[PDB]
Design a protein around this nucleic acid. Sequence first.
RNA 1: AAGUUUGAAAAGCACUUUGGAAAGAGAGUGAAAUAGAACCUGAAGUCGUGACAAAGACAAUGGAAGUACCUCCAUUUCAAC
RNA 2: UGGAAAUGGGGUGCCCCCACCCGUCUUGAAACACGGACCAAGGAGUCAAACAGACGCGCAAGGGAGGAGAUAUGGUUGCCA
RNA 3: UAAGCCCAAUUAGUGAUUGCCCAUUAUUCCUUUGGUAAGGGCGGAAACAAAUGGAGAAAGUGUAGCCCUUCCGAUGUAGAUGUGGCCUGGAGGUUAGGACGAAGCUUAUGGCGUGAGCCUAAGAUGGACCGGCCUCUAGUGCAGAUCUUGGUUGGCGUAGCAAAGAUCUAACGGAGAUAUACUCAACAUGCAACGUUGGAUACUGGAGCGGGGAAGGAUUUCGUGCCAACGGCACUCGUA
RNA 4: CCCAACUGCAGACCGUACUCAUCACCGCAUCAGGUCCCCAAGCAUAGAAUGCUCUGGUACAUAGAGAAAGGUACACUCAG
RNA 5: UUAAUGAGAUUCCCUCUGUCCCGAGUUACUAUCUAGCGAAACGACAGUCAAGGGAACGGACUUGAAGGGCUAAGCGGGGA
RNA 6: CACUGACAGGGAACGUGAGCUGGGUUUAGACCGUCGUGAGACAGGUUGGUUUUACCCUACUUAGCUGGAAAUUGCGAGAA
RNA 7: AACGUGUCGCGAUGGAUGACUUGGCUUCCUAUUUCGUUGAAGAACGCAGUAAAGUGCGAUAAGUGGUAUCAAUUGCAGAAUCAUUC
Length: 152
Amino acid sequence: THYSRKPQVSSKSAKAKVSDLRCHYKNTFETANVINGMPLRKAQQLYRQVLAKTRCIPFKRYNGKIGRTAQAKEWGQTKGRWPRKSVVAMMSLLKNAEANAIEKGLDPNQMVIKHVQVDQAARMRRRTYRAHGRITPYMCSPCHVQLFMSEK
RNA sequence: AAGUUUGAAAAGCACUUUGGAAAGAGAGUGAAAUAGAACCUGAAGUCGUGACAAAGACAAUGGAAGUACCUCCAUUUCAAC
RNA sequence: UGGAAAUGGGGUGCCCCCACCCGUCUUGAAACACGGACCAAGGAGUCAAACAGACGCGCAAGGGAGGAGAUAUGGUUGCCA
RNA sequence: UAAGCCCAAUUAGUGAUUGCCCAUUAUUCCUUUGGUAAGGGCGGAAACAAAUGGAGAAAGUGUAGCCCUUCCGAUGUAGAUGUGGCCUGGAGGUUAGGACGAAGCUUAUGGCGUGAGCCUAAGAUGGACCGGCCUCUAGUGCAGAUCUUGGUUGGCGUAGCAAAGAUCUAACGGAGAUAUACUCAACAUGCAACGUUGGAUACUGGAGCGGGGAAGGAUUUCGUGCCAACGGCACUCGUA
RNA sequence: CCCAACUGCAGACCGUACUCAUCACCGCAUCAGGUCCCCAAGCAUAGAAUGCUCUGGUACAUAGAGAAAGGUACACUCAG
RNA sequence: UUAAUGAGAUUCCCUCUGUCCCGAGUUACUAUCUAGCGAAACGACAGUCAAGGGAACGGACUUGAAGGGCUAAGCGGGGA
RNA sequence: CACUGACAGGGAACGUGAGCUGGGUUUAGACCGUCGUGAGACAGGUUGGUUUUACCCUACUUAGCUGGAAAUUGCGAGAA
RNA sequence: AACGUGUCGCGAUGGAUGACUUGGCUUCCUAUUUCGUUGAAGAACGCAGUAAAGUGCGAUAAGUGGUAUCAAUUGCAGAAUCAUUC
Ligand SMILES: NC[C@@H]1O[C@H](O[C@H]2[C@@H](O)[C@H](O[C@@H]3[C@@H](O)[C@H](N)C[C@H](N)[C@H]3O[C@H]3O[C@H](CO)[C@@H](O)[C@H](O)[C@H]3N)O[C@@H]2CO)[C@H](N)[C@@H](O)[C@@H]1O
Ligand SMILES: [K+]
Ligand SMILES: [K+]
Ligand SMILES: [K+]
Ligand SMILES: [K+]
Ligand SMILES: [K+]
Ligand SMILES: [K+]
Ligand SMILES: [K+]
Ligand SMILES: [K+]
Ligand SMILES: [K+]
Ligand SMILES: [K+]
Ligand SMILES: [K+]
Ligand SMILES: [K+]
Ligand SMILES: [Mg+2]
Ligand SMILES: [Mg+2]
Ligand SMILES: [Mg+2]
Ligand SMILES: [Mg+2]
Ligand SMILES: [Mg+2]
Ligand SMILES: [Mg+2]
Ligand SMILES: [Mg+2]
Ligand SMILES: [Mg+2]
Ligand SMILES: [Mg+2]
Ligand SMILES: [Mg+2]
Ligand SMILES: [Mg+2]
Ligand SMILES: [Mg+2]
Ligand SMILES: [Mg+2]
Ligand SMILES: [Mg+2]
Ligand SMILES: [Mg+2]
Ligand SMILES: [Mg+2]
Ligand SMILES: [Mg+2]
Ligand SMILES: [Mg+2]
Ligand SMILES: [Mg+2]
Ligand SMILES: [Mg+2]
Ligand SMILES: [Mg+2]
Ligand SMILES: [Mg+2]
Ligand SMILES: [Mg+2]
Ligand SMILES: [Mg+2]
Ligand SMILES: [Mg+2]
Ligand SMILES: [Mg+2]
Ligand SMILES: [Mg+2]
Ligand SMILES: [Mg+2]
Ligand SMILES: [Mg+2]
Ligand SMILES: [Mg+2]
Ligand SMILES: [Mg+2]
Ligand SMILES: [Mg+2]
Ligand SMILES: [Mg+2]
Ligand SMILES: [Mg+2]
Ligand SMILES: [Mg+2]
Ligand SMILES: [Mg+2]
Ligand SMILES: [Mg+2]
Ligand SMILES: [Mg+2]
Ligand SMILES: [Mg+2]
Ligand SMILES: [Mg+2]
Ligand SMILES: [Mg+2]
Ligand SMILES: [Mg+2]
Ligand SMILES: [Mg+2]
Ligand SMILES: [Mg+2]
Ligand SMILES: [Mg+2]
Ligand SMILES: [Mg+2]
Ligand SMILES: [Mg+2]
Ligand SMILES: [Mg+2]
Ligand SMILES: [Mg+2]
Ligand SMILES: [Mg+2]
Ligand SMILES: [Mg+2]
Ligand SMILES: [Mg+2]
Ligand SMILES: [Mg+2]
Ligand SMILES: [Mg+2]
Ligand SMILES: [Mg+2]
Ligand SMILES: [Mg+2]
Ligand SMILES: [Mg+2]
Ligand code: NA
Ligand code: NA
Ligand code: NA
Ligand code: NA
Ligand code: NA
């Protein structure tokens, strides 16, 4: 799962990624995309406020027949959610990215996220049992997440 | 059902750092690591991403003519030629 | 002699005018007739025998085997079934 | 005072007998293709180096068609036939390519062909085979048979995961926290969910989620470790 | 040789864990179905009806928030 | 023909009632919102109408009338 | 039969079953009559007999967000 | 605006294609070539320092003996001899 884009200045950037996360791809897709252009500290604050349920993750693409909320108005939407499993996974990834920036000698307070990509990982198979003795797939959809941030 | 068909050789990634771990970020080996492990080549379909093109509602696609903008394409020409 | 000027090609959009969904059975399909979500790989006039005609070739009042022998080979992994 | 109906005109009692607009039709011009095609040329006329008029000319069904001139036809289901027509695997010949990169794969890479297709360019693709031509040969060309196998996919984070009533609390255990740029005292920025023990509340109500056996199962029994996958939520727990 | 009361020595083989079920068996599964036997307490009551209870067992079966319409219910009521 | 018997078929009467006049209120579990998890059916392409013709009952065609885009909960007219 | 001003006739796939209901009609059980040698038959009678799926698109019902006069552009300039 | 659409670059998912072939299929040939109560074929259970399957073997159990060969086996470990036979 290589990085699809390269940073403008490599020495002033930090990279982080995770493969086969075992989080729902669609929920993680929405969670990671909202921080694409944000400063690292602002992204961390938003995730904490999502866990506190004072702010929400806007669901822009995979939002078919989900509920509506007022907390999505700040993103220009009406449908949003609070996917805590995706959120805590993304916060761990941000911590790894911050550690990489610290290791390279950069200041995390000045790091701005520049690239966020979420991909559909290989699917894990389970089965569910249906009426009239039918067996039917019960699939798990993990995701690949990659990001990098650069000093502003 | 299923070719373990990585590489010439395991030389199968020491060591540093973050992480409970998985792994990530570095660093190394190798001609090649996008050859990293049941790993040669890696198509189609589908999806993510950045850049750009725009676009009401005539479902979309299509035909014929132009035009706007773009073009890592081709060819020609550059002096009384 | 330039990141050049031209002409052609390619790409995307837009105008005006055209333009019913493929395959199929059927007198008649755009059909309120049936098969029709996408892609990859696979998927259907073949082999043998009898006869006939057309055309090519050899010979011709004659044509031709076939089976089997013979030895170059009573040799050679094989070429040489 | 038709843009209706009937009749009649073509710029109007002026001097003459074509108002205007639309075809895959007609005439004509250019190009292609095929003919029951029609003809001409094919005994190299002579002469001609570079520095500074050219090129070709094949006795021919079919090709980049030997060349030139001329005339006519050209749509079409089922179907027939033809094609120096296209393409695929293999064989007999011939001629080439490849570590300075073969096959395969990719394309806003163009060029050529009416077309099947062929060829070049680029790969910041690949890493060892392979192209053209004549002949031979066959398991030789896919869009669809409720076709076969494999993979994918919208529906979709949707339907739902609602019988068997019900859980609460503290401490301990655990990576599973009380996890924060600046500002800022804590609330308004780390949520949720756990295993054990003690309390609390309730359930099973002896025809029992009690204690033992047969059939069936065969290590599920016990202890320690362990959380990748599995127990359709979760687990630090487990018949994993 | 036969007995009695002793005594001395020797008493082989296989089975034996666990389960027997709203999770250990069958039903594709830890499936509200199916599956033979034994032991069976207190009170009310005619009682193996039904309700509650000491012993033993259990809170395991996705949960949280929470008065939309419409539903399901081994949930009710309604003037004349 | 027939006493007794019957989850058998039929008619009337008493009692009774939300069967109805004619609907209303309440409860548990759903739906609804959230966390975790997560399908299938179906899927030519698609999806606003009127008339006209048409394989005589069009979402595509002719001529008109509509049509800014994207969404949540419902609903059963159509999608022969 | 009764009330009433009046109790008019019709259409909408003989409107309307993923709206219900299932009495009838039209399976398999069974009885009778008639018919048939028989198996069986009868727009003759009788009794008993599983009514499945919407979460898709439109339509309708409500419920949110939000561009836009060159109806996204032109800078393309029109004031009830 | 936002969903959504289209194109290009780069990634993911997915294992087609090519190259590779200790396999299959098919056609020939050779011969002191045809099992077993002297217990066969088949079935079962065991055997290694380390050993589930498979293979080999049978309490002499990944083998004993003999002949030839002529310095190994090999993931680790073990091992007199480094060798005319012993
Ligand atoms: N760009 C648009 C799309 O390109 C596609 O094709 C693209 C790719 O299949 C193709 O392959 C590219 C290659 O060009 C490029 N030079 C290198 C790249 N590695 C390749 O990409 C390939 O490898 C990478 C990983 O290495 C994968 O992530 C990726 O999925 C795979 N397609 O490059 C093509 C772009 O020209 C499709 N043909 C088509 O759907 C569409 O036109
Ligand atoms: K001609
Ligand atoms: K010729
Ligand atoms: K076809
Ligand atoms: K989907
Ligand atoms: K035990
Ligand atoms: K699991
Ligand atoms: K009540
Ligand atoms: K009785
Ligand atoms: K129209
Ligand atoms: K009806
Ligand atoms: K019967
Ligand atoms: K009944
Ligand atoms: Mg819903
Ligand atoms: Mg919703
Ligand atoms: Mg089920
Ligand atoms: Mg079953
Ligand atoms: Mg590569
Ligand atoms: Mg622009
Ligand atoms: Mg154009
Ligand atoms: Mg017909
Ligand atoms: Mg016909
Ligand atoms: Mg048709
Ligand atoms: Mg019709
Ligand atoms: Mg038909
Ligand atoms: Mg048919
Ligand atoms: Mg005149
Ligand atoms: Mg023709
Ligand atoms: Mg072949
Ligand atoms: Mg393309
Ligand atoms: Mg074939
Ligand atoms: Mg195909
Ligand atoms: Mg739901
Ligand atoms: Mg629920
Ligand atoms: Mg319940
Ligand atoms: Mg349910
Ligand atoms: Mg805090
Ligand atoms: Mg907490
Ligand atoms: Mg009780
Ligand atoms: Mg019991
Ligand atoms: Mg145990
Ligand atoms: Mg689970
Ligand atoms: Mg015992
Ligand atoms: Mg026991
Ligand atoms: Mg028991
Ligand atoms: Mg059970
Ligand atoms: Mg079975
Ligand atoms: Mg008493
Ligand atoms: Mg009882
Ligand atoms: Mg009792
Ligand atoms: Mg249970
Ligand atoms: Mg349940
Ligand atoms: Mg009453
Ligand atoms: Mg009875
Ligand atoms: Mg259909
Ligand atoms: Mg209509
Ligand atoms: Mg239709
Ligand atoms: Mg309907
Ligand atoms: Mg009628
Ligand atoms: Mg009707
Ligand atoms: Mg019905
Ligand atoms: Mg209906
Ligand atoms: Mg009935
Ligand atoms: Mg009846
Ligand atoms: Mg009848
Ligand atoms: Mg404007
Ligand atoms: Mg303006
Ligand atoms: Mg073994
Ligand atoms: Mg012995
Ligand atoms: Mg020796
Ligand atoms: Na692809
Ligand atoms: Na793309
Ligand atoms: Na013409
Ligand atoms: Na002609
Ligand atoms: Na009509």
